[PDB]
Symmetry: C5
Subunit: 200 residues, 5 copies
């Protein structure tokens, strides 16, 4: 089988609107942000405009194929796959995806999607012009799938632009969960704590 055959079989099997739960097990989604740039910071409005690679992985075992004598990976448009409905709870702009909207699918059904995103957040910008810096917390989880359907798991300056006016002191990525006043269900999130300051 060649790449054309692998993509045809993915198109025949993939259900982009169906979460690929295995044994009524939650889909385990791994989310990890790599900060690339901090573009605009407003300490009076508590708003930041950031660029980050949102490294996202999960398994869809329905997409698996035998790769003994075939490619074991292909690039696929995300419109052909199920993708987790992740949202940043303190976002104040829609995610601007800067890069081609392609995922990698491995022959075992593992999916990797790493969009470069520019987005604006409401977060604590107090202290940005001090030595100890600001700590801006970004919360990302499923918008519509509670913890029985999607679980979110985490995994500093390595890809950060050396040309930014700002620098990263530390990034922490911690598992958390949100429950709503109405309903029993918990929604999982990753809390990403970006400690940064203006360069001296």
């Amino acid at each position: 089988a060649d790449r054309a055959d692998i993509l045809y079989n993915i198109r025949q099997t993939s259900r982009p609107d169906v979460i690929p739960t295995q044994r009524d097990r939650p889909v385990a989604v791994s989310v990890s942000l790599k900060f690339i740039n901090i573009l605009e910071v407003n300490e009076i409005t508590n708003e930041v405009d950031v660029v980050f690679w949102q490294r996202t992985t999960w398994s869809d075992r329905t997409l698996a194929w035998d790769s003994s004598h075939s490619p074991d990976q292909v690039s696929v448009p995300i419109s052909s796959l199920w993708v987790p409905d992740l949202a940043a709870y303190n976002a104040i702009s829609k995610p601007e995806v800067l890069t081609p909207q392609l995922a990698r699918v491995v022959s075992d059904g593992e999916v990797l999607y790493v969009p470069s995103i520019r987005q604006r957040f409401s977060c604590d910008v107090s202290g940005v012009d001090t030595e100890s810096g600001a700590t801006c917390r970004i919360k990302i989880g499923s918008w519509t799938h509670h913890s029985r359907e999607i679980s979110v798991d985490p995994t500093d300056s390595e890809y950060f632009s050396q040309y930014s006016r700002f620098e990263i002191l530390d990034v922490t990525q911690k598992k958390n969960s949100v429950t709503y006043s109405c309903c029993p269900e918990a929604y999982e999130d990753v809390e990403v704590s970006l400690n940064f300051r203006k360069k001296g």
Copy 2:
């Protein structure tokens, strides 16, 4: 039946362009705003820029399925369902939907859609910098369906409000109301949401 079968059945039965009226009853739509952020306020132009969760529910009994031995809820793209044609009568920008455009459909045909919306409004910002604050009224109802076709009913004010806003919420009231246009006798139902807020 699995999630795939539920979504296939929704695609076979859903009529996104047909209001799901049962007998000749109006569709009962519940609308409730949770304020998340107040980003900009202009006392001279009487304009506010806000982020809110618009919690919207209704019933479409054509979508119902037997869930004795299947999932009793699924996430569905709103493009596959009928959605009420709600509009904010005093909006001065298009609603910017920040979140994935997915609804939850329950096996009894109940639908929940909770978009996070950033939008700008024309409303009374007088008193915003005083202790008693401003009261900004936002009117949301059906644009094209009168009260025989759609009825709109309302349901801690600060529980999800950003601590990083320059503003704080004193009170939110959500009241039933109706608009009638000069030209005809038909009444359009709305919820009037009164946001009493002030500068910190």
Copy 3:
């Protein structure tokens, strides 16, 4: 017949791409603006940013159905119907439609479409900070259908925001026509004259 049947039959019969001319008659389009808000005014550049309800009506007899024992109206997405190709001749931005893009179709084939539009115009803003105010003229007609294919007919503060910095002194809506030096065809328009000023002047 239920609403589903009416919409299915509209989808079967409606030709969104075909102007519904009856006999060899122009389609009679009624256009009427209700001003809701005046957002930004620049007296140096002569530009205004306004929100208005563009009340639009016409008849498409191909859509008609027997409603003796069925609903006599439905809401329909505009993508399923023919809609007049109206444009503002002095617009300097695309019309931003703020509302659901649904029309009402009555069982006699009458169509009503009332989008809330935010749009920017090049017009006379001189005098906005005077007692007599500015008069900004907006011209709306068919972009591509001349007067033998589409005729445009008209029909003040009732829906204007009380919270605007501006007040409306008067709105007049007058029938007009444009002819191009090139070609014989006359294009009908409505000329909407918005006379407004800043509130609270000395």
Copy 4:
């Protein structure tokens, strides 16, 4: 045949991705700009923001019909037709089409498309505040079709409310050749001479 029949046959016949060359001839595209407004000018950055009607005509004879006893012209969405791939070589923004994206198709296969475009250009703004004014040159031609495939040939509607006025508009045939390749690309060079009032 009624309007519905003419539009159905246009939809059945039209090849939006195929240049409608007749014989071995280039498609003859006529382009003429009518300036409506000059909105912003920057003498330091040499940038202008302008509104113009881009009057564009060509022939697609495959669309022709007998109109002895039928309408001679119909409005068609451009997404149903072949349209020349015109670009402004010195544009620094995407063309913003302000008007309904409909062309007129005549029963002989002539096509007319007149979008109202707002667009920003890099051009000579020096002298805008003088009596003799600035001359901003806009070059428009096929991006991907050379002169064997497409040939390009060339104040009444200018807003009285602009803070600028038009002294003169010249529209001259020209061609661009790339150092890489033999192919010549035809263009119209539009010289807009304008000044602050």
Copy 5:
């Protein structure tokens, strides 16, 4: 064969979502920028806004045809072809494509795509107001295809606007590769070094 027959063959054969690899060879993509304009430069934020023609070529030999007695080129919408998933690694805005999204397909299966792009970058703007000027480095390569699937190869003021406030001192285009600390795979790129200054 007429143009319609050539395009119908392309539309039937082209697989827009499938990289056209020959055997287990990478697809060899050529990328070359021609700078047209430098519009905004911010020495405090280290941001530039630029317009460039991104000349992009590759081969898809499945598309080839006999042109002895037919056109040897046609214009095709990129939505009907495979196109390399190129991205600028230091971009801070989406690429704004200013031109029609058409590629040329040549009868030997060579494909040429030359979009005019306006885009904003994070790069070194220090020295822009000096005689020696700033050097802004732009990295462009495959976002999702490593060096076994796509190889990227390069190939000065000739098309640069005389009306810019800036002028080009030099452009160098060098082959490079990026590796991620996660995985063995190398991703090929072109590093374009734009040396420019205020006039």
